[PDB]
Design a binder for this molecule. Structure first.
Ligand SMILES: CCCCCCCCCCCCCCCCCCCC(=O)O[C@H](COC(=O)CCCCCCCCCCCCCC)COP(=O)(O)OCCN
Ligand SMILES: CCCCCCCCCCCC(=O)SCCNC(=O)CCNC(=O)[C@H](O)C(C)(C)COP(=O)(O)O
Ligand code: SF4
Ligand code: SF4
Ligand code: SF4
Ligand code: SF4
Ligand code: FES
Ligand SMILES: [Zn+2]
Lengths: 230, 62, 185, 10, 169, 60, 108, 140, 63, 385
């Protein structure tokens, strides 16, 4: 197979290349290269919500779960480092029912504002829900809600439609270099914000628009101007 | 009358009085003939505007 | 006859050099043969006792602008007596001429003419091969992936010369192509 | 589902 | 050798083909319908029957409060097979997502109802009007004010049609 | 070079001299999936698109 | 009759070119007196026009391309022979710079 | 024991003494395809069904029993099939397509994607035993 | 005139006749004006009743 | 010999028909139709639109049997998608296919009679045809181009009062057929204007691809809904009429008998129709209910993602064929694997029938050409895609 997206694997040590079985097709990857990256090398594309290849690895949102033969529980492929001679399993009932079960929880409290979401046509949540999800839908009770707090003249925020993937927090803490965005609260009902009136004052502060998967953070100048398909 | 555009006509409707932290807005009294349901957390002292209808909801208590 | 029975018998009975590629499925039995053995294969399938393919349904054509043999003409056939449906397809080119089958099935003349009209695939010893669908003086073959949807020329009435004339196309509103294709597929 | 294919030699 | 050679039957056949019995029998049938009541209707005063599902004039509904239902979701523009709907949107100072240009080319429109059944808010509908007959071509380019005028005019009947068939689909 | 197929295509001759760009479109930043990669397209530069002076439609 | 199979060598291609040109000439008077045009154009210049059109594709080397071009030539000729082409279509069809382009448009 | 006097198909007239014209056409086909190499499957199949059809025509004279024992079509349809088979045999002889080219490659796909029960599927009835017996003879 | 069913603000009056088993002459309009009447004067409330869309008279549809 | 041309503007020749034919003064020797006057370009347009956006093109192909082409397209999509369909949807699809058969047979018969010279049956058949066009106008919006049949099931459920009205119509439709037949079968002019005209033999019809009534007229018992029954047709019992000698009159009798058989099938579907859902529960090609898209997040997501992107048919290629009233209507889909069809060739039955006009009108008179045109029931929407 060929790597998905044309990704280039840089072998800084030719001697160290552990061989793993992603789905029965053995591939060679260097030390490190967590199970997600090993599957990326072998041309297998795994769902992801919290994992960005440019930021630190976080384990929440439990969406990239796969099955390893020598593992009782499904493992987080985006965080578990590769080991020699693993028999990974992706298209398995365990690794599938894991994904529908997780995405049902993701969608149970999501608001129904798709027609007015500025990220309607390019949302990872709905695009993955169509592929890796159950169509029925079981939740019937009252959802939660979060009020919207202004920050920046160019970042329109609707935190009601925010899965707490903490990707924006990690970006602001690591790449942007200014620590103004953080995660506040505990349990079901934790919010993400500055906790004060301050706005994101950074030169590369507009990258939170793209990095956030769902339409929680969208550009304010491009508010409702057009859809992605047109 | 038709000189009042919806922009300045929806603002003349007084905000709704409701108890609780959140309220569910469906548009029409018949759920099938309204918009998708929109739970809004009305915690700020300003009225919380439904994104579909434009109706404003404010908390009677406190 | 049963679909697998046609598979087994035809594959065993047919000369081996005729069929380059062949496929069995629920969608339909397919015989991908060479461009020069097509006439002989059709003649064999028409006259053989067990496989009496007497009626030709249609002659199709698919444009693949990513392979050396760009076009692919598809011959859908039907055996009325044995209640079976066989499909024979070959590969063509912009300049390669492929033998006609009008001698076997006289109804194939119009289908070959329309294939030439749409894809520009000529047919050997075809009587009266000319454009059938597009208008008179048409330039280009519309069904190729290269041909723009709106075409190259327009039609209107000009008053200085009391006739209907043609100009290069000038669209009042361009065809808005919506790219709905998404990843995770 | 499998969509397998086997090439045949002389 | 088709034969009808019998003394009695030759007389019976040679009379039917000589006194035009078939012609008379097919002639007396039209006279039966001559005196029968007609099936036509005087169109201007009496209209033909329709259905609650009829596909006619496009209309842009609005909420009973007075705010327009269209939220510029652009599903109707994307689903329209004829590509007749053009939409332009921007965020008003109220922050609401609304349309500024929503024009339908009723000469490209095919009246299929795909746009009507794609709205998540029932913003656009196809009213029961079928009497456009404009004398000018550019009058057929409805431009979001004709839509709203149609919605205001037919609201009392579009609402009834929608609530009558809301149990379906 | 070798425009014989271009000559026999029958398309207007003035469109045979167009400059085109060949590239593989990159993955969009707003999405994380890589299911739209590895496919090459020819990019004719259709720059000229004015606005219809009746309804604002984009003519070409 | 039917379409000729192909041309293996360039000599057959040249022979077919000559045959097509000859046939087009033997068909030149019927198209002169079927479109009702006698004094507007003399039959001589149409011969030069056809010769120029044929000589235009002088750089072609593939015999198959030559064959298909000749086939298109017969198709156009046969279309013209019948009273099918629109009136006077044939006569219209068969008849520094930098500043000039700059003063008109940006796309030259 | 009576003349058919109607085929039910327009343009396909009845053939009196159909057994006579069908008993020698089969012999002509059998004696004509001797030139085809024995290792080719076409000859084996054509001989296998032609011999059985010729026999069945031999034991029984009246066309009703002939067509009931065979169970396929009518006597005139069988005659047309025999003529077409003879013409195909001649064309095969003159074409000589027998043999396998060197470094021959055949691409075979046996994908099995199920389709719903309610889409048009050409389902025929069970065949007479000779169609299967020919395939068994060919394979072994 | 078997039955007169309601009136209109424009002045055009609405009638109704009931048949037995075959359609014909069920309900029609008597337009108030005469200057070619434009063939389109029925309001939205009475448009549904006229075309057999709804069984409501139209005066009831206003309420 | 002179070569005059047709192209009459009155609907005798169904319009948009150009016929350049050479006669021997009184007797025609060769007729060469010039099709292409109605080549809209549907085949090129289908490739540019989603599998759902391309459905109404199939209404515009054969516009007397609108639901027959939608049936073929839906069956092709289902075969490519491997989607099961509930019994109620299959039964209503069969019912409306039979209604299309009745409509098309009525229109063909009375346009043929108008061409011959009979005028009365035309108006009677249209006052009948309105009573089924209103059935179409009830289940969906438009009377003619009803996009009622979707790939999954059907568009939406039948209204409450439709079955009673359909049964009431079928009560008297047989008597109406008998009244129409009274003036044509027994009439001696009708026989002399049809007998021994346009004879086609079964071998020659097979050679020219005359699948349909033109095949069964020649004595071939070939019915696509008996040989390859697709929807619920094994349960329904009906007889397949077969002609004895096919010449412009056994075809007419076969069309009468097929109208009666369609009436019988409609009665059977009405009596045997079950209750249940109408659209498949796959929810990949079927949209959620309007009450569910406004209450459930997954339902709204699916609605949004199938009313813009549409369903993606897995990469394959199939040929499906259904027994359209004209004949064998076949749709050949080639699926790229995306949400748009790569190639959709449409096998119009009228193409081969119009091709076979040249030999059928051999050594006939000029007045025996309009009857050949009428007796094959050609419409140029399908002939010129
Ligand atoms: C009440 C006042 C009414 C006043 C009006 C009078 C009634 C008019 C009614 C007209 C209604 C029908 C009109 C149709 C017009 C066209 C019909 C012509 C058909 C036709 O000519 O048929 C022919 C017979 O007609 C004929 O033969 C017709 C002539 C009748 C011959 C006489 C019949 C009985 C003779 C007994 C004599 C008794 C006295 C002996 C002492 C032969 O038809 P074909 O073509 O099939 O033939 C095969 C030979 N190629
Ligand atoms: C009213 C008119 C009706 C028909 C109008 C048709 C108008 C277009 C005619 C067809 C246009 C074509 O390209 S169709 C014919 C195309 N064939 C070729 O271009 C041959 C390539 N040239 C050569 O072989 C030699 O150079 C050659 C120049 C022949 C001699 O030169 P020499 O011996 O030194 O070698
Ligand atoms: S973020 Fe995605 S799932 Fe949520 S409302 Fe927006 S488009 Fe829909
Ligand atoms: S705001 Fe966006 S990036 Fe930050 S946690 Fe929420 S969804 Fe993730
Ligand atoms: S689908 Fe309805 S709400 Fe959305 S843009 Fe169109 S008219 Fe407006
Ligand atoms: S009815 Fe159909 S064609 Fe017309 S605007 Fe609506 S979706 Fe577009
Ligand atoms: S993407 Fe790996 S756990 Fe979230
Ligand atoms: Zn609301």
């Amino acid at each position: 197979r060929n790597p998905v997206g044309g990704a280039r694997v840089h072998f800084s040590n030719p001697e160290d290349a552990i061989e793993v079985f992603v789905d029965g097709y053995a591939v060679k990857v260097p030390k490190g290269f967590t199970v997600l990256q090993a599957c990326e090398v072998a041309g297998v594309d795994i769902p992801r919500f919290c994992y960005h290849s440019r930021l630190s690895i976080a384990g929440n949102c439990r969406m990239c779960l796969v099955e390893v033969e020598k593992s009782p529980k499904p493992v987080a492929s985006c965080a578990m480092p590769a080991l020699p001679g693993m028999k990974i399993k992706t298209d398995t009932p365990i690794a599938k029912k894991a994904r529908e079960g997780v995405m049902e929880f993701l969608l149970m409290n999501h608001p129904l504002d798709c027609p007015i979401c500025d990220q309607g046509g390019e949302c990872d949540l709905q695009d993955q829900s169509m592929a890796f999800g159950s169509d029925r839908g079981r939740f019937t009770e009252m959802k939660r809600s979060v009020v919207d707090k202004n920050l920046g003249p160019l970042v329109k925020t609707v935190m009601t439609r925010c899965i707490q993937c903490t990707r924006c927090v990690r970006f602001a803490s690591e790449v942007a270099g200014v620590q103004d965005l953080g995660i506040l609260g505990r349990g079901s009902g934790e919010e993400i914000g500055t906790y004060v009136e301050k706005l994101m004052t950074s030169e590369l502060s507009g990258n939170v628009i793209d990095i956030c998967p769902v339409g929680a953070l969208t550009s304010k100048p491009f508010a409702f101007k057009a859809r992605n398909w047109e | 009358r038709s000189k009042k555009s919806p922009m300045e006509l929806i603002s003349e409707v007084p905000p709704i009085k409701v108890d609780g932290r959140i309220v569910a807005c469906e548009g029409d009294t018949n759920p099938a003939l309204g918009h998708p349901i929109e739970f809004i957390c009305l915690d700020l002292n300003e009225p919380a505007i439904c994104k579909y209808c434009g109706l404003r909801y404010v908390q009677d208590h406190h | 006859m049963d679909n697998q029975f046609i598979f087994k018998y035809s594959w065993e009975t047919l000369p081996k050099k005729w069929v380059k590629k062949m496929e069995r499925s629920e969608h339909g039995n397919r015989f991908d043969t060479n461009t020069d053995y097509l006439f002989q294969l059709l003649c064999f399938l028409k006259l053989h006792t067990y496989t009496r393919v007497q009626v030709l349904i249609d002659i199709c054509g698919v444009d693949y602008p990513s392979r050396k043999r760009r076009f692919e003409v598809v011959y859908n056939l039907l055996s009325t007596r044995y209640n079976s449906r066989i499909r024979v397809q070959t590969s063509a080119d912009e300049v390669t001429r492929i033998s006609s089958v009008v001698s076997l099935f006289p109804s194939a003349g119009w289908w070959e003419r329309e294939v030439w009209d749409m894809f520009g695939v000529s047919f050997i010893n075809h009587p009266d091969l000319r454009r059938i669908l597009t208008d008179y003086g048409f330039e280009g073959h519309p069904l190729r992936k290269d041909f723009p949807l709106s075409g190259y020329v327009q039609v209107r009435y000009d008053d200085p010369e009391k006739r209907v004339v043609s100009e290069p196309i000038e669209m009042t509103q361009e065809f808005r192509y919506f790219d709905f294709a998404s990843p995770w597929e | 589902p499998p969509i397998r294919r086997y090439v045949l030699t002389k | 050798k088709e034969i009808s050679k019998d003394w009695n039957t030759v007389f019976e056949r040679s009379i039917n083909t000589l006194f035009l019995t078939e012609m008379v029998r097919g002639l007396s049938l039209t006279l039966k319908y001559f005196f029968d009541p007609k099936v036509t209707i005087n169109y201007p005063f009496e209209k033909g029957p329709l259905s609650p599902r009829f596909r006619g004039e496009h209309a842009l509904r609005r909420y009973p409060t007075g705010e327009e239902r269209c939220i510029a979701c652009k599903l109707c523009e994307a689903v329209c097979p004829a590509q007749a709907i053009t939409i332009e949107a921007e965020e008003r100072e109220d922050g609401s997502r609304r349309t500024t240009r929503y024009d339908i080319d009723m000469t490209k429109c095919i009246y299929c109802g795909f746009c009507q059944e794609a709205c998540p808010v029932d913003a656009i509908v196809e009213g029961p009007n079928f009497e456009f007959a404009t004398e000018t071509h550019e009058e057929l380019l409805y431009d979001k004010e004709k839509l709203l005028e149609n919605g205001d005019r037919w609201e009392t009947e579009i609402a009834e049609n929608l609530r009558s068939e809301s149990l379906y689909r | 070079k070798r425009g014989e197929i271009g000559k026999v295509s029958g398309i207007p001759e003035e469109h045979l001299s167009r400059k085109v760009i060949i590239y593989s479109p990159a993955r969009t930043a707003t999405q994380s999936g890589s299911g739209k990669l590895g496919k090459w397209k020819i990019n004719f530069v259709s720059t000229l698109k004015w606005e219809n002076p009746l309804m604002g439609w984009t003519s070409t | 009759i039917g379409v000729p199979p192909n041309s293996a060598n360039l000599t057959e291609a040249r022979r077919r070119v000559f045959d097509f040109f000859r046939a087009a000439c033997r068909s030149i008077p019927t198209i002169m007196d079927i479109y009702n045009l006698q004094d507007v154009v003399a039959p001589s210049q149409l011969r030069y026009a056809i010769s120029a059109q044929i000589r235009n594709n002088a750089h072609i080397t593939d015999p198959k391309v030559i064959d298909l071009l000749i086939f298109k030539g017969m198709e156009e000729l046969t279309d013209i022979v019948d009273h099918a082409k629109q009136r006077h279509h044939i006569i219209g069809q068969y008849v520094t710079d930098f500043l000039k382009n700059f003063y008109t448009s940006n796309y030259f | 024991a009576k003349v058919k006097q109607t085929t039910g198909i327009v343009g396909l007239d009845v053939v009196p003494n159909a057994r006579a014209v069908l008993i020698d056409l089969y012999s002509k086909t059998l004696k004509e395809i001797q030139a085809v190499p024995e290792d080719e499957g076409y000859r084996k199949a054509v001989e296998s069904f032609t011999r059985q059809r010729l026999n069945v025509c031999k034991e029984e004279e009246d066309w009703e029993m002939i067509e009931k024992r065979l169970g396929c079509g009518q006597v005139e349809e069988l005659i047309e099939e025999a003529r077409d088979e003879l013409t195909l045999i001649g064309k095969m002889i003159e074409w000589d397509p027998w043999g396998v080219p060197d470094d021959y490659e055949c691409e075979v796909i046996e994908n099995d994607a199920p389709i719903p029960k309610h889409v048009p599927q050409h389902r025929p009835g069970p065949l007479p035993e000779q169609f299967y017996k020919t395939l068994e003879g060919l394979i072994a | 005139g078997a039955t007169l069913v309601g009136v209109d603000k424009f002045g055009n009056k609405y009638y109704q006749k009931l048949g037995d088993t075959q359609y014909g002459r069920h309900r029609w309009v008597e337009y108030a004006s005469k200057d070619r009447y434009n063939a389109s004067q029925v309001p939205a409330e009475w448009h549904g009743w006229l075309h057999f869309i709804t069984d409501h008279t139209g005066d009831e549809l206003l309420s | 010999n002179f070569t005059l041309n047709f192209g009459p503007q009155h609907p005798a020749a169904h319009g948009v028909l150009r016929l350049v034919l050479e006669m021997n003064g009184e007797v025609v020797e060769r007729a060469e139709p010039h099709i292409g006057l109605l080549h809209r370009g549907t085949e090129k347009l289908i490739e540019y639109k989603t599998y759902l956006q391309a459905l109404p093109y199939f209404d515009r192909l054969d516009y007397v049997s609108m639901m027959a082409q939608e049936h073929a397209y839906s069956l092709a999509v289902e075969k490519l998608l491997n989607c099961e369909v509930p019994l109620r949807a299959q039964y209503i699809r069969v019912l409306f296919c039979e209604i299309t058969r009745i409509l098309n047979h009525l229109l063909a018969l009375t346009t043929h009679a108008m061409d011959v010279g009979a005028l009365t049956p035309f108006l009677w058949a249209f006052e009948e045809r309105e009573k089924l066009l209103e059935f179409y106008e009830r289940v969906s919006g438009a009377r003619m181009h009803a996009s009622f049949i979707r790939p999954g099931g059907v568009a939406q459920d039948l209204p409450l009062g439709l079955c009673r009205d359909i049964d009431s119509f079928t009560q008297q439709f047989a008597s109406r057929i008998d009244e129409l037949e009274e003036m044509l079968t027994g009439n001696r002019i009708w026989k002399q204007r049809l007998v021994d005209i346009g004879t086609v033999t079964a071998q020659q019809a097979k050679d020219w691809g005359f699948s349909g009534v033109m095949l069964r007229g020649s004595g071939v018992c070939w019915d696509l809904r008996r040989a390859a029954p697709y929807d619920v047709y094994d349960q329904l019992d009906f007889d397949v009429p077969v002609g004895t000698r096919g010449d412009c009159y056994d075809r007419y009798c076969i069309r009468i008998e097929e109208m009666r058989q369609s009436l019988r099938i409609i009665v059977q579907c009405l009596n045997q129709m079950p209750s249940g859902m109408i659209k498949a529960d796959d929810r990949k090609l079927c949209p959620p209910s309007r009450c569910r898209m406004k209450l459930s997040m997954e339902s709204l997501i699916h609605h949004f993602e199938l009313y813009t992107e549409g369903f993606s048919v897995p990469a394959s290629s199939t040929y499906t064929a259904v027994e359209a009233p004209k004949g064998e209507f076949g749709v050949f889909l080639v699926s790229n694997g995306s949400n748009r069809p790569y190639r959709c060739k449409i096998r119009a039955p009228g193409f081969a029938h119009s091709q076979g006009l040249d030999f059928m009108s051999k050594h006939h008179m000029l007045a025996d050409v309009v009857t050949i045109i009428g007796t094959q029931d050609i419409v140029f929407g399908e002939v010129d895609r």
